Design a protein around this nucleic acid. Structure first.
Ligand SMILES: [Mg+2]
Ligand SMILES: [Mg+2]
Ligand SMILES: [Mg+2]
Ligand SMILES: [Mg+2]
Ligand SMILES: [Mg+2]
Ligand SMILES: [Mg+2]
Ligand SMILES: [Mg+2]
Ligand SMILES: [Mg+2]
Ligand SMILES: [Mg+2]
Ligand SMILES: [Mg+2]
Ligand SMILES: [Mg+2]
Ligand SMILES: [Mg+2]
Ligand SMILES: [Mg+2]
Ligand SMILES: [Mg+2]
Ligand SMILES: [Mg+2]
Ligand SMILES: [Mg+2]
Ligand SMILES: [Mg+2]
Ligand SMILES: [Mg+2]
Ligand SMILES: [Mg+2]
Ligand SMILES: [Mg+2]
Ligand SMILES: [Mg+2]
Ligand SMILES: [Mg+2]
Ligand SMILES: [Mg+2]
Ligand SMILES: [Zn+2]
Lengths: 97, 73, 165, 51, 98
RNA sequence: UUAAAGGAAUUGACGGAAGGGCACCACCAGGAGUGGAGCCUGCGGCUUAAUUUGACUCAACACGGGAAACCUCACCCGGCCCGGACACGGACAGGAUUGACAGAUUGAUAGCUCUUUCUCGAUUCCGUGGGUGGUGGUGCAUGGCCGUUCUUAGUUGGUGGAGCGAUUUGUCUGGUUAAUUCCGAUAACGAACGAGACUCUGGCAUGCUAACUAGUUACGCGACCCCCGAGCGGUAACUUCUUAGAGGGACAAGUGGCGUUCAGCCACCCGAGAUUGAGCAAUAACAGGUCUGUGAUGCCCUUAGAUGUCCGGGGCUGCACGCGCGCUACACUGACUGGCUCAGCGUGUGCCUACCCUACGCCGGCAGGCGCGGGUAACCCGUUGAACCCCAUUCGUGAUGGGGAUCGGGGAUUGCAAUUAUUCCCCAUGAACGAGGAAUUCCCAGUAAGUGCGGGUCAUAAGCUUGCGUUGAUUAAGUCCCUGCCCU
């Protein structure tokens, strides 16, 4: 049974990961590590101008999608208890049994 | 810009479609002062000819609502 | 029964944020509008309007906030009361530059000329804890040519990364 | 009455933008529909930074 | 020029039930997507709501493709004219508040 | 006849005046080239019923990510629709407002119109006021954005002197740096915006934190050969290799010299690095461009036979010429064939409204078709088995087998339709081009150049552009002579 935590920024990602570690390592659960995924980047290049004057000056917009996975083998009643967390809004939670 | 769309006029005048009829339309006929004689043709049962009659033509027949086409020699 | 990728759901949520925020700043231009914060909970999607004059958001009899909740629900597809709105009061009026420009707009509309309006907003922002402010008003300002009227007071950082926050 | 011909299911005319129904400039396929002139102003709202 | 008669009573009944209407810019010429709630796509909705936005009954807001129609208290005072036909029922906007 | 003319003096602005500096969009010593030929694609001019349009030295000319079969399309040719909101008012049809079958005309089975006559139900049609739309004009009315000045280092206030005062010193003789960055002398002091500092990528490392959506050592299942415990591949622990969190690590610090105590330059070691590349980026302008990005907009024009909006075509491509950015060659350091061998960014499905990425097996010579499977993704393509390169054969200085322009025939793919343009494959036709005058563009180390891949355009789709990888130099670390700019 795995849980995917995918956040917008790495600071809130590490804060909710530290909260999950602090709320999980006291129970009788063999907690697997927050497996680091490679950072995804959506690169968009923009002309910067509505009309064609000047040099070829381009905006380069990027995001940094950070993804983490955790593994917790347990009955399904424990997963719903762990899931109830007062969480940062920039964090997305998925479960997979 | 300088080229102005002017009326070259090979086609002088045309008018819109104006629906004109007579004053009143009597589809029925009085027999024996109370019995109605049907003159025009009805439409067959395809949920169209419950109150819709056909129009006279040289060789065709036409329904009003659902536009049913009929032809007979 | 449908799903989209992580690389597209993020930009769809970001376009949702910008769409909702700028629709609310285009229809809630009357009161003091600051911004929105959307919490994603699959039982109840929470939308918090941070605003200055929250009395207009609360409405007369709890009218306008429920009406705009219906406005969100009848397009964005969340039946059964999934979308729930909450208004927050911004007591620091001189903190939000969006609210300051939104209040400067209604003073520039009905009379209340540009010199008096600019010094009146600069005195308020400088009194409300801010270390510096700059108001740039440009356009047709008493003449055919576009005279740029700029006013700067206090301290202002222009270059580098921490300008954005 | 012939109201809708020329079905416009492909190409440049089928791409109608999300911002102002602009169709002259191109519209990207990233899960995104912008006009490339408003994308600069609205990237800081939808979540793109310059770096 | 008229639609079937169910169209007008359906769109004003939906406005009676909710008070919020939304349509998009796409007037029938490239593509024909129908309304997400009813049968008539965009143009009959605009023809029904232009008589309300022109007389000052229902306010108009535009967002990026979409016409949102907004309810006024004087809007309800002139929806009394529509309320001539059903019994007097206030929709779920002004009556109660949870 | 006029309410100014005039005199010192301050700050801008200007100069075709002087001095000092900076820049590889300036040069020296060089490299690649362009300008020469062919082709691709814009511009001017021609031609045309239309060949839409703006932009014209850097700061226009593969720019509007502008790669058009209709779409895009704003230009011509012909033809439908009102979405004419809303008020008063004309007929109000004793309730007749819009929709069409067959024939003619027209691409049309468009009731566009005509012959014909059924249907729809008080929302109509017309007029009088007003309203909407416009990729119509006006960027010299404008907002916003971008470019340029300027990627150069330049601007301002508080106290204090100098002057009656606007103002000036601060904000500078010299040295140094990429820098108004400091030391210094000092009528100046503490200081601000900017440059740095800020953020990201790249470079290091740990028995720190940890991973069956990423690997390693042993080990068993298990294929092969010598047969001599060995060797290469397929299917219980730890993060060294793949990825990412924090912290550390580099500061001119250690030494010697050059320097006024100095600010600072030069040579070496330790080190992975003696400092890499970007983003943001001061006051202030250009009367630079965008109303053709917007439901951002002022003014003017049209609004029912329409500059509104639909349908079918043509056009933007049209060539006696000139110019710019580019692609390919002019061969032997090379072309042909066969074998061998290595990547990294990033993208990919049932999407806020119509849609891919592709493994396998078969058929076909090929471009391609058919059936099935996986992937909403470190899972599948994919251990991206790329090009260049390495080895061997053929050619032998011939416009040759280099170059593949032009042109003929055939076959498949997407599209509803590619013909006065698709695209690809097969055969064939086989031009100029023998390293390019006058001039001109870019560049100081994983850099130029060779070479391929991904995205943007898309449905079929690059020679454009943005990023990524592979191979990978010769020259400088200097100056004010050419050009441009800054300061007194
Ligand atoms: Mg102006
Ligand atoms: Mg002016
Ligand atoms: Mg300005
Ligand atoms: Mg265009
Ligand atoms: Mg004088
Ligand atoms: Mg030059
Ligand atoms: Mg060219
Ligand atoms: Mg020409
Ligand atoms: Mg040109
Ligand atoms: Mg241009
Ligand atoms: Mg025109
Ligand atoms: Mg136009
Ligand atoms: Mg104008
Ligand atoms: Mg004095
Ligand atoms: Mg001075
Ligand atoms: Mg590794
Ligand atoms: Mg400036
Ligand atoms: Mg508007
Ligand atoms: Mg060329
Ligand atoms: Mg080429
Ligand atoms: Mg698509
Ligand atoms: Mg040919
Ligand atoms: Mg496409
Ligand atoms: Zn748009």
């Amino acid at each position: 049974i795995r849980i995917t935590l995918t956040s917008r920024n790495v600071k809130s990602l590490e804060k909710v990961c530290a909260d999950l570690i602090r709320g999980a390592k006291e129970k009788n659960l063999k907690v697997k590590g927050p497996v680091r995924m490679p950072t995804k980047t959506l690169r968009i290049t923009t002309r910067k101008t509505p009309c064609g004057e000047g040099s070829k000056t381009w905006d380069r917009f990027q995001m940094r999608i950070h993804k983490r996975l955790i593994d917790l083998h347990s009955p399904s009643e424990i997963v719903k208890q762990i899931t109830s967390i007062s969480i940062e809004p920039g964090v997305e939670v998925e479960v997979t049994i | 810009k300088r080229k102005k769309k002017s009326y070259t006029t090979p086609k002088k005048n045309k008018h819109k479609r104006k629906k004109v009829k007579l004053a009143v339309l009597k589809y029925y006929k009085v027999d024996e002062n109370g019995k109605i004689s049907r003159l025009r043709r009805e439409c067959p049962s395809d949920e169209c000819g419950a109150g819709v009659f056909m129009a006279s033509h040289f060789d065709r027949h036409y329904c009003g609502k659902c536009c049913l086409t009929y032809c007979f020699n | 029964a449908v799903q989209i990728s992580k690389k597209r759901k993020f930009v769809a949520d970001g376009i949702f944020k910008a769409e909702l925020n700028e629709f609310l700043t285009r229809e809630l231009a009357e009161d003091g509008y600051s911004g929105v914060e959307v919490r994603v909970t699959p039982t109840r999607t929470e939308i918090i309007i941070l605003a200055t004059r929250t009395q207009n958001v609360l409405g007369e009899k709890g009218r306008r906030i429920r009406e705009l909740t219906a406005v969100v629900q009848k397009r964005f597809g969340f039946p059964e009361g999934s979308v729930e709105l909450y208004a927050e009061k911004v007591a620091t009026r001189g903190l939000c530059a969006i609210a300051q420009a939104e209040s400067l707009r209604y003073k520039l509309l009905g009379g209340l000329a540009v010199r008096r309006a600019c010094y009146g907003v600069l005195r308020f922002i400088m009194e409300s804890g801010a270390k510096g402010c700059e108001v740039v008003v440009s356009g047709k300002l008493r003449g055919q040519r576009a005279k740029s009227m700029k006013f700067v007071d206090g301290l202002m950082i222009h270059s580098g990364d921490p300008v954005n926050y | 009455q012939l109201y809708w011909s020329h079905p416009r299911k492909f190409g440049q005319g089928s791409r109608s933008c999300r911002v102002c129904s602009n169709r002259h400039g191109l519209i990207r396929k990233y899960g995104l529909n912008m006009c490339r002139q408003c994308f600069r102003q609205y990237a800081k709202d939808i979540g793109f930074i310059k770096l | 020029m008229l639609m079937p008669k169910k169209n007008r009573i359906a769109i004003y009944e939906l406005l009676f039930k909710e008070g919020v209407m939304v349509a998009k810019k796409d007037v029938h010429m490239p593509k024909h997507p129908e309304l997400a709630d009813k049968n008539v796509p965009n143009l009959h909705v605009m023809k029904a709501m232009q008589s309300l936005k022109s007389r000052g009954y229902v306010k108009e807001q535009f967002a990026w493709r979409h016409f949102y129609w907004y309810l006024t208290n004087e809007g309800i005072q002139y929806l009394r004219d529509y309320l001539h036909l059903p019994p007097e029922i206030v929709p779920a906007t002004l009556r109660r508040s949870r």
